[model samples]
Target chain A: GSHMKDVQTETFSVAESIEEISKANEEITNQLLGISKEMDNISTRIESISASVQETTAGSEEISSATKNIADSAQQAASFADQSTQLAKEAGDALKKVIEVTRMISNSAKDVERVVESFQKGAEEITSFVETINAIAEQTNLLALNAAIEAARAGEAGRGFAVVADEIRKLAEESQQASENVRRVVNEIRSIAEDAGKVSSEITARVEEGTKLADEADEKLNSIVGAVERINEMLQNIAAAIEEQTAAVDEITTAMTENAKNAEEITNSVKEVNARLQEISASTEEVTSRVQTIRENVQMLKEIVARYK
Target chain B: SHMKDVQTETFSVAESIEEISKANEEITNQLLGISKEMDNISTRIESISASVQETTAGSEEISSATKNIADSAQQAASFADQSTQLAKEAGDALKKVIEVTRMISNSAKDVERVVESFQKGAEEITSFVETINAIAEQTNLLALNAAIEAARAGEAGRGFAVVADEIRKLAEESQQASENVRRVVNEIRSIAEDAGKVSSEITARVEEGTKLADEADEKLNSIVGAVERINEMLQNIAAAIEEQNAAVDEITTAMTENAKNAEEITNSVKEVNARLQEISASTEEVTSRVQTIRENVQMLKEIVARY
Candidate 1:
């Protein structure tokens, strides 16, 4: 009976503790599994958010560089446009001055032609004047002949008249010599007129040639200006496209910024959950360890309880 | 009654262990779902990162394209400038030409005026030539008179006749010289007239050329104004793009910071997962301990049965 009391109570107590320990361990096992599921979910969410954040960072990097590129390009376009504008002004100024110059040339040629024509006329006149000089010489010679006749008519007194006639004849010869000298100078003037006429016609052709060249220059300027305008128009179109592109980049940047903020909050939440999970796991682990210890010692409890019974 | 209670408790413990295993199975399924979601999320993130990388590449592509466009625009601008300089030089040259030509035209006109005086000289020369012809006729008549007087003086007038003959000889010489001069003068007048005709023709052509030059000047002014407008638009574009670049940089920096924090969260999750697995293992050991308790309970029940 004494042995029965000791062992019987021991068995009862051990069974009681074992039953309690088994139930506790089973419940805790379930709890641990549930906590594991939750932690897994949190872990996956945190990982996903982490990946998304990285993705956003990379996208923004692209946007940043791309936007900068657009800006630089736009800057280049602006600089070029300014240069083109500056050049256009310079060209315009030059064009105005040149136009005036071209006009003047034709008139100059005309004047030259007219002047040359006058020189030719002068030459003719000079030649005509020489003829007068020659004629005057003839007249003087005729006068000398008449004097000689009158002197002859006076005979012995005509001898004295003859001497006087001889003197008159010498004077006529001198007058003809003077006329010859005038003719020589006039002849020189006439020849020069011929040369002047030659120059007038030669310059006329040149004046016309230069005028054509001036016209050519004008045409070239017109074409070049048009080309510049065409380029300007196209470049401006590009500028407009870039403007839209820049706006898009800005919007994207704003979106990414918001997402980044969200990622931070998500990460923090995950961390908080994870910290909670850590505490839970530790408590859960402690519960299981104690359960096992209790389970192993149940024999002692059963022995005591059985003996009592 | 106590035996019945002990048996029920023992049975309860076994059933609970079974229940715990079922619970673990359910939780494991949930874990599988969570793991699957994580795997999917990770894959999607990888795809996202891939897409993000593509954007950078796209950004690089877009940047290069923009650069090309800019470079081309700059080239066009340079071309415009180059052409402008070249054209301006032409304009300057043309202007100088016009100026000098104008001076020359003035000179031509002045020369014409001076040259026209040559026609007056031509008239004067013609007058001299006519005078010479009249002198020639008068001289011929005078010679005729002198000859008649010599004839009338006869033998006494023989000496007179000799003087008359000498005078006639001189008159004839003068007439021949005068005739020659008249021929020269006529030739000169004909040539001079021809020259004048040519000069008039040249003047007409020059005037026409000047009119064209003036028209070209107007076009150049129009170009200048258009270019100025283009420049203004370009500056606006540059500023607009620059602002976007700054915004993008800010976004990238924020995103990168967030990514770092996310990385920390992932590490924290990993630690959490490790602890959870550890906790589950301990719970499993606890469940295994329940089996030990059941066996002990069986022993106690058997020992009690012996009682």
Candidate 2:
């Protein structure tokens, strides 16, 4: 029992220290609760940001699709123009040939008329020759008749001569009748020739008229050919222009693709920045919590000090 | 001496009670500090969450923009394909027109050949008529000579005279043959007329072909006009597509920024988690301090009871 006093003193000191520690623990626990509440707030903010990122991704996809559609439409138009130009050139060449054929037909008609006219002239000359033959035959028949009369006057001595003269008169009359037949035939030939000539003239006139029409057609064709040539040229130019435009479009498409890539990179970077900010917020919360705990522990240590008193 | 001993014990007990109360106060203060730390960590977590939300929003915007750009590029590609198709169609149409025109030209050439053949036929008929006319004139001259010979032979013999008269009749027959030749010439003339009529028809047909060609030309012109318009439209589409491409690029940039922001948010969230853990640690420290204070108070009470 000699060390009892010292033992009592030691007990008292230990008791004071315990009291300080207890108070410090209580304060620190309370501060820890506050830090947990801040963490909860930070978690909510993170969730909201994640949701927004998802929505933006969807919108970008839509815009890319719309642009592609427009490019397709432009290509179709260029193709149609090329076809039209080729057609026009062909049409122009066809018209030129038609006009040439028309000219040949007109010439043939004129030739036919010339042949008919020659026939008419020949017939008229034959009719005139027949008239002359008929007049000579009549004169011969009259002379033969006069001879026969003289032979009768010579009586018996002129009997043979009279027979000869009668025969001659008969022959002359026969010749005159033949000449009249020839004239009749010539008249018929003239009438036929005139009729043929009239028909030929009518044909010639029609062919000439046709020739005029053909010429007009040729003129029109020429005009059309000219116009078509112009059109073809224009169409070709358009096609060329379209080709150029297409080339330009292709370039733009390439550029756009590049832009899209860049955008993607940017998005990634933003996300990184966001993560860093979160880290910072977390660090701040940790510091705040630690300070609160330290404050609590200090309060506990002060209580222990009081117990020593 | 007895009163002094009682007072000392009482004072000792009071002092012991005071010490225990002080210990409880210290424990309460430590517990409060821990609680405050926990609250601070919670606030940081909340702040981190707010930051994450903003970053995530930015990331979402960037993703949306990227998607838009991709979609627009696809659309532009589609437009380009369509334009190419249209250009092909126009080219085909033009080719058809060229073929038709060539056919018409060939037809015209055929007509020209027909006309030439007709002209040759007419010339042949004209020559045949001339030959017949010459024969008729020769026959008429021979007949006149025969009639003169008959007259000279009349006195030679009466019997022979009858034969001579028959010869004269034969000569008259020859004269009629010449007149028949004239009719043959007239028939030849009629043939010429028929040939002329046929030639006229060929000319008319040629005219028609020309007209058709004209029509074809007009059609070609219309096609050209349409193609020109199509080209213009294509140009416009190309421009629009280019604009879309640029927009897409912008979207991509925005998306990238958003992604960066999202990453930052994630990082901040992690930090918040760490802070929350720290807050929990600090709370544990506070609880320990409170426990120490409680122990000290119990000890103090024991001391006081002993007294």
Candidate 3:
């Protein structure tokens, strides 16, 4: 009876041990459940992370291409600006030349006008001289004729009469010859003078036309100058506008380059995180398998204990 | 002798000669007036020639200037064309940017969709985890019942005691593995949350970029409009220059014609001047001869007086 009592006591201790072990098994199973829930949460998070990273990489590439396009446009705009600037400069130079030429023409016309005035003064002096010579000739002709008649009357005595007649005849003939020559020369002078007067009038008309043309040219040159200036103004504005546009595009390009770098880093980091998440997922799967085995062992223990019951 | 008769004849002769001399003097005076007029005309022609030469030179200058202006006009036209092309390219670039931004926005939406599906998958995993928890609870209940039955079986359950001991060891190992899994899950959860936040921020940034692209498009359109205006102004400049060139050409032609006329006038004036000088010298000689005749007559009258 004492030996059976010893056996019963040992069995009671073993049962207490089993109870303790069962409690531990229960705790472990509960922990496995918590782990599975946590792993599920991790899987959701990893998927979100992976999607975000891929989007960032794709968006960054798109932005890179877009920025390059902008850069190209800016370069082209700058080239256009340069071309316009050169054109404006050339136009301005041409306009300046036109203005200078007009001024030269005006100056030349004034000089010609002065020469005309001097010519008119000289002509007046020559006319007065001619009038004086004509008046002297008239007085001389009358005196010569009267003297010839007096000499002829004085010569009217015998032999003296013949001499006086001869003298008077000589005098009368000489004076007549001189007067005829003067009359002939005067007639020629009159004809020449009339012709000169006609030609001089024609010259005056030509000069008048020239002066007018010069004035017209000056006006046209002024107009050209104005047009050139306006063109230059427009060119300046165009260049300034293009410059501003280039600056804006450059700023955008810089910003995009910086964004691209940030995106690259983000993508790399996300990839690293993704690798780690994969590892954790795999481990979680292994843990699930382990938990299954633990559950099978507990079933076996349960069956064995039932036999004891 | 017949001295008184001779005097009468002389008087008659004197009267007739006087009339002739008076008529000649009047003719000479009229000729001098004509000569004076010719001198005036000759001087005028010289002046005209000088003016024409100057005008011709000016016209040539104007022609060259017009040529220069034409060249500039052509260059400006080319510039305008280039600017137009650049504007088109700029517009194209802006359009591309808009397209890219749209794609980025679409990509973001796709990511959002992917995240939504991922969340759904996680929810399904959560349900599965709950099922696992239920199984674990049932296992724990079974283990508790088994332990109670083993206590009732006493010494007979000794073999079950060893089995329970083995179960406890396995359970402890499982608990250790589960704890490891939980730690790893926490780490992954932290990183994933960070990634999720970053993705949300990226989406927001992309949206902002899209808006910026829109604003850029508007500004580019404005630039294009400005470019068109510049082209119009350039065209106007070119037209104005062309008109100016034509006007200058006309002036040049007129000046050339004037110069030709003036040269002809100069030749005429030179001819007239030569004629006038020749006639004037002849008149001087004629007057001198008349003076000589008057002197001779005066000498004869003095001799008569002495007689």
Candidate 4:
């Protein structure tokens, strides 16, 4: 009975141990709730991250488009720059030709001016020639008139008569010469102006009145005398306009020299703008492309995570 | 002594059972905590996934937009090129205007030189005309004298009268030509002067246009400096986008990791739950045995009281 009692007591102690363990489960269940609360916290945090991710994608798109726009604008600006540069060069070439032609014209005008000055001198000489001819005719007439008047006073005798007769005889010879034609009246001019003036004038007047008896006489007159006349209105107008035009050309030439260089520089500035635009365009495009790398990295990350799942 | 031993044994035994129960409770609580942690991680991962997915679409859209911009950029370049061409043409036209104007002016200069030569001849001609006039006057006067003498008359007188009349006629011809030449020279001089003044006017007008063109060039030069500044700004834009993308990559990688880890924790939580159930059943069998021991103890006490 004592041994059985010992056994019964040992069994009671073991049973008590079992009851204790069973009752502890309620506390374990309670402890588990703490872990549940921690899980909830993490879930909240992940949700927040997802929302942020959505924003990031949207932001990326925005950046892509904006950058692309800049590139487009830059391209346009570059093209314009190239075109302008080409055209400017062409213009410069064309201008060179124009300047060349203009220079020729200016040179010609100077030549004309030189020519005209010389021509004027010729005209002056002709005037003198005409005067000399006049001198001869006038003196001949004066000598005749005086001789005729003297004839009444002296009756062709005495000192007056000798002079008158000699003068008359001289006048007769001059008349014969006029009919035959004197090669040049110029040779007689210097001597005849003073001592021979009256004689030459009377003879010349008489000869002129009688008319040239020789065909040669008429030929000499025609050869010596030119059909010179006053400048007509048309020629005067032409001269005036040409001089004006010459000066005008000078002004335009100077202007081209100044303006052409400036315009080229202006075009250069435009090209400068084009280059600037290209810089910005390239920068943005690079960024957008960089995003592609990011996308790849992101995909790789997701794939790596798939292995864990 | 026997009573003391029984009491000590019962007390010690109950205490030991109580410790075992406490240990079981502790283990269950620890496993439940682990399961809860796993569930929490899974939930967070799902949230992150949803958020990341939303962001991915946004990124895709951005790419599309960027592509369009690239396309447009190409077109814009064409447009810009067209503008450039037009601007060049304008410049070309401007040059042509200068060229053409220069052409006309050169012609004037050419004509003026020619006129200058004409004037030089005119001077010579004028002198000749004056010379002619002087001689003609003298001739006419002489002719008048001769004609007068002819009125008196004789062989000397008759021949003299005929000659005198002829001289009078010759004198008229000489005088008339000299008179016409003077008027001609005056007209020539008048025309030449006009050319010089007109040329001056054109020079002044062309200069005016040149000044304006220069002014435009100066302003463009000033604007060119603005291009220098664009370099920095363009770099900033690209750098900004790159920076953003770089950060996004790391974030997404970590996000997926979180999701996978959380899901595994949830799965592990299920194993924990099963283990907790087995522990409860084992605990109950031990409690039933404890109840039997309590009854035996009570019976032993009753028998002792009877014996």
Candidate maximizing lDDT: 1
- What is the lDDT, from 0 to 100, of the residue B195 in candidate 3? 37
* Model 4 / residue A107 / CA error / Å: 24
Tens digits of per-residue lDDT for model 4, A1-309: 453354345444544443443344444344334434433443443344334434444433444444444444343333433333343344334334433433433443233333234334434344453554445444554655555555556454324333443454354334334322221322222222232223323322322232222222223222211110011121233234323333432332333233233323323432343343333234323323433432333233333223432
Write model 1 residue lDDT over A47-96, tens digit each, in one string: 56455555555655555565455556555655555455555455455544
Q: Rank the candidates by DockQ, best first.
A: 1, 2, 4, 3
For candidate 2, lDDT tens digit of each residue in B1-307?
2223223432443344344344334433443443444344344434433433443343344334334433543443343344334434433433443343344344334433433432343344334334434433433443344344434534543433343344345435435544554465456546555654544454465456446545654654565465456555545554554544455455445445544544553454455455445545543454454454445445445544454
lDDT tens digits, residue span B182-289, model 3: 343344234334435434544454444345435434543554454455555445444544443454444345434444543443454355345434433443443343
Q: In order, what are the TM-scores of chain A for the candidates?
A: 0.62, 0.53, 0.47, 0.44
Tell me how far the alpha carbon of residue B306 in candidate 4 is from the true structure, in angstroms, after superposition. 5.0
How many clashing residue pairs appear in each of the predictions shown?
30, 177, 2, 100
In candidate 1 chain A, what residue range of length 10 has the lowest lDDT sum? A291-300
Give per-residue CA lDDT, model 2, range A154-260, as digits (tens): 46634654565566556556645655655554455455545544544544454344334433433433443444344334334433433443443344344334433
Best-to-worst ranking by TM-score? 1, 4, 3, 2
lDDT of every model, 2 decimals: 0.52, 0.44, 0.39, 0.41
Docking class of 1: incorrect
Question: TM-score (0 to 1) of chain B, per candidate?
Answer: 0.76, 0.51, 0.73, 0.66
- Candidate 2: regions farther than 4 A off: A1-309, B1-177
**Cα lDDT for residue B66, model 4?**
34
Candidate 3: tens digits of C-alpha lDDT, residues A13-121: 3333333433433443343344334434333433443343343334334333433443344344434444444443443343334334323433432333232233233
